[PDB]
Design a protein around this ligand. Sequence first.
Ligand SMILES: *Cc1cc2c(cc1C)nc1c(=O)[nH]c(=O)nc-1n2C[C@H](O)[C@H](O)[C@H](O)COP(=O)(O)OP(=O)(O)OC[C@H]1O[C@@H](n2cnc3c(N)ncnc32)[C@H](O)[C@@H]1O
Ligand SMILES: *Cc1cc2c(cc1C)nc1c(=O)[nH]c(=O)nc-1n2C[C@H](O)[C@H](O)[C@H](O)COP(=O)(O)OP(=O)(O)OC[C@H]1O[C@@H](n2cnc3c(N)ncnc32)[C@H](O)[C@@H]1O
Lengths: 523, 523
Amino acid sequence: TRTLPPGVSDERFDAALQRFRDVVGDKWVLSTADELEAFRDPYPVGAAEANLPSAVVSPESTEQVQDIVRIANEYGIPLHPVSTGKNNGYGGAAPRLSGSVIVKTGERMNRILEVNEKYGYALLEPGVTYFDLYEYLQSHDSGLMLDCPDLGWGSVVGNTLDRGVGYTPYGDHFMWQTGLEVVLPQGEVMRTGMGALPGSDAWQLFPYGFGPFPDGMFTQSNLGIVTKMGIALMQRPPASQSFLITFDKEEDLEQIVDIMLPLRINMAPLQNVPVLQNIFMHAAAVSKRTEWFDGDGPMPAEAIERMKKDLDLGFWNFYGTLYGPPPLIEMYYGMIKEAFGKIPGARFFTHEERDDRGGHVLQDRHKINNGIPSLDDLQLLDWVPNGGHIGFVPVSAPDGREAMKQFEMVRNRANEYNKDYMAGFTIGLREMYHVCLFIYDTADPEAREEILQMTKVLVREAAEAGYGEYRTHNALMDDVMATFNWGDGALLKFHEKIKDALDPNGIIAPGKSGIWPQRFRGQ
Amino acid sequence: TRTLPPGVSDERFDAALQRFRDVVGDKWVLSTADELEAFRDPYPVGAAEANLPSAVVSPESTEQVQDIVRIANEYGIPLHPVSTGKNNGYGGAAPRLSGSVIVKTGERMNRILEVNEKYGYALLEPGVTYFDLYEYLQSHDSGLMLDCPDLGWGSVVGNTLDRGVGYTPYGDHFMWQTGLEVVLPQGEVMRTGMGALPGSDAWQLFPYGFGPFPDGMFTQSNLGIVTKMGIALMQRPPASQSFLITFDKEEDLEQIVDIMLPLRINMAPLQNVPVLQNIFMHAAAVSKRTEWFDGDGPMPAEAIERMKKDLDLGFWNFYGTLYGPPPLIEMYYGMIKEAFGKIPGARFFTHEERDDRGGHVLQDRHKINNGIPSLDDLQLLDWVPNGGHIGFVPVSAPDGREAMKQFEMVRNRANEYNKDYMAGFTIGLREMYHVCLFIYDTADPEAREEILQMTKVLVREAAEAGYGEYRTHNALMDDVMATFNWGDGALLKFHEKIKDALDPNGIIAPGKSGIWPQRFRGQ
Ligand SMILES: *Cc1cc2c(cc1C)nc1c(=O)[nH]c(=O)nc-1n2C[C@H](O)[C@H](O)[C@H](O)COP(=O)(O)OP(=O)(O)OC[C@H]1O[C@@H](n2cnc3c(N)ncnc32)[C@H](O)[C@@H]1O
Ligand SMILES: *Cc1cc2c(cc1C)nc1c(=O)[nH]c(=O)nc-1n2C[C@H](O)[C@H](O)[C@H](O)COP(=O)(O)OP(=O)(O)OC[C@H]1O[C@@H](n2cnc3c(N)ncnc32)[C@H](O)[C@@H]1O
């Protein structure tokens, strides 16, 4: 069943493969069943085998990436660029279009090119993971801290370019991205910002450069392959304090949101990203599902109460962190206690005060909120056997009623599909995320098809209520982009015009974010 | 000499004009010499008549803007979109390409569509000036403050889309821009971000939306005409304190910069944009040049000393502002005094302590740094008769030696052209601006040609030392874009591919930021 790129003969592909090996070296071009097994989406969705790579090519230099791209152009081979290819929750390393060659840039392009203590930035290659970088910072006893997502094994660049987020004050990764080098779809190479001016020291100091500001167009994008990217790094504060706030009632959501907003909007006293997660989220962190209920299908209210009482946690649980000199920390912690204190049954705990099994999450958020990469959230996959996950994160105004409506909306449709409402609400500055995680048996084809359908429904429903996803799984890219159809799909038509201008042979990551080049449209 | 669009007959233009009048109304289409005089660059540069509009069209609705664009497409008429057309220092309202129709969106599209106290944003049309908006905020007794540039008569949208800056903590305008509506070059209309999702309340709450993030591409851009744009508005703090720091020695620059940086980089204790301006800048604010020296050509050192002694000001003068509860203000003001205090001859003054004639600037920066639009900087045009100005602002790393090198570099070449070094250094977060303003006789054709040459030289020289401009005058767009030529002009080739994809008839603002569509290239 040898996987072949669309409309490419066995012969031409053998030639191309040869030319690829000529570029990177025989060792670093894979093209057999056994070898290609490793790059399967590790959390598959759907019953069906979807996404299947024709080869993997691991280049070591920008110049190689250029050569590959030129070759792919000649032969009309689709390319799927990845950094680490651990985009887990959103489709791992599997290409939207079958028969694509995966370009694994991060396998060999994994250098920390520069870290600068004075101006507080780093310039990185795609292969640099959050662990790799944190190690460097500890090794060299830096005064800087990174900002990490939940799972630290991923690329810093990869994450940034999916507009991923973290929970320190530098939590909007794209905001702090400064400068990148990218290979455009026909093999040209380009630098943005002050990188475009030979000799400039400001590549990682000033993002915008001169003329139209393009970096954004390389996020959630198929307009190139990024080979280098800068990111600002905040200075480690003198001290920090994490804390939990347990709220008993499921109805506390309304007043929690409406109180969070005015504490966050001026980046004080809530200086990190406020995150509020439900009880099911805390159970999965520590226990298996069978511990609380052994029926297939939804949990009864008695289970929920047992989970609350045993772990000693509210239905909603809020986690914040404060940074600065201890006066300021105390001053702010007080303001926060006075603020949320006005909700019946609101208990408060610092990262000192809880070493019990319910305070596991608090210990974990203390690490994350301080730029310490973990893999703690993989423990949430032991909730059920063969556990995997899919992410769904609609965006809305930070209003209690609106939050309550989302809670009802999702949990409802979730129970219809016999799945647990593992959800949270977080707030950026003026915006609300409904961070839903759904855990499922990855070895059961039914379960996979069910999850796919469920999210597709959640997406359709959310969009009908005015809620769009900020990011989605490989499997729902087409669906999600269809929700952003104002002006009769004006946005996507724009994306398409640009896609076709930079990528006339339709080479790069066809379908990414729902954007297909001309030769794939009509399908 | 009736001005005509490139390659359009008197007849076709008369038809088009008719079709334009059909769209907007006879009153709002201008096309005679007397009428068109008003839209001349009010601060001309060069001896020669450059830039000359064939008509002005003032639409009232997005839908009209669409109709105009469709008409312009048919006839191949170039369009020059403006909001207010007070881009003074950078070419006013005059089109890069002669025979262009100016679209004055801000004449009639000047509504404040929404201001939202809870979430802290506004949604604006192009015609809303900083005065218009500030009035609204005072009228409605808002808890919000705007962030204004030096000259308040300009558009909020216009400014934002040139990546203009201000001096409050919300001083990076583009950063706070959230959502826009734009008419693309073939007349299509589009919304970015959560605006693209029908029903979403998050258009001004979350900038990025889904898929590639395009807003940046409409800054310093000729890729459309913006009809609506959102901007976040910071909450007015409880209280504020502005302050001056006079430094005697011209050599104090080195240590001033190296001390400013670490006070700014964590947005505290320097919470506004630190701005340091030289003595000549303060003289022009209050006096005429003849007052200090009556020779044509550079000022002698005795004059400079007289200016210092009379106004009671250093060669460099630093202006900051602090925001918050009075404890925090005092705590930060102290840290700042201790910090800069380590420089011989450094005196400190609050906005209370100086009502003399040297403290005029301090009074003005207190207004600006607090979101109070002025036109105070027009007083700098009385330095010489028929005064006008051109801006030149290179970007560099915030390093003392680097600053000192820029100071020497510019002042040197400035004196060769018999012009005064009206300059400042400011710092964003991790970046340095060399804010040079050059004032000149606008009624003297020699003076105009001299200024043009001078800046072109300053630009060439700066670029050779690794310094690019963040923004430039109409007259040097081609020159500046030529400095960003890494990878053999990779950046501009990219811009061109996109320009040609969205604008196949080459309609919108040909030449803006050096970006010409196919039909104008080879010239
Ligand atoms: C399973 C899971 C995942 C997860 C999470 C919690 C769980 C239980 N929590 C997250 C969180 O709090 N925040 C967040 O941002 N992500 C979170 N995730 C997801 C995931 O593990 C992380 O996002 C991770 O940082 C992303 O993985 P990685 O960094 O390995 O990404 P990639 O495959 O290389 O890149 C993803 C996409 O980006 C584009 N891309 C990547 N590299 C390039 C280059 N060089 N050029 C162009 N485009 C590039 C591609 O479209 C690629 O598919
Ligand atoms: C003379 C002067 C100018 C000045 C200044 C001090 C002096 C003495 N100080 C400034 C400062 O501190 N900060 C700053 O950002 N600007 C400063 N200036 C310059 C100027 O007065 C201001 O920048 C002003 O805000 C800009 O003028 P305006 O707001 O009137 O701009 P415009 O002509 O309408 O727009 C300029 C360009 O933007 C693009 N544009 C504008 N509208 C649109 C629409 N609707 N669609 C697409 N593009 C648009 C055009 O390219 C236009 O030429």
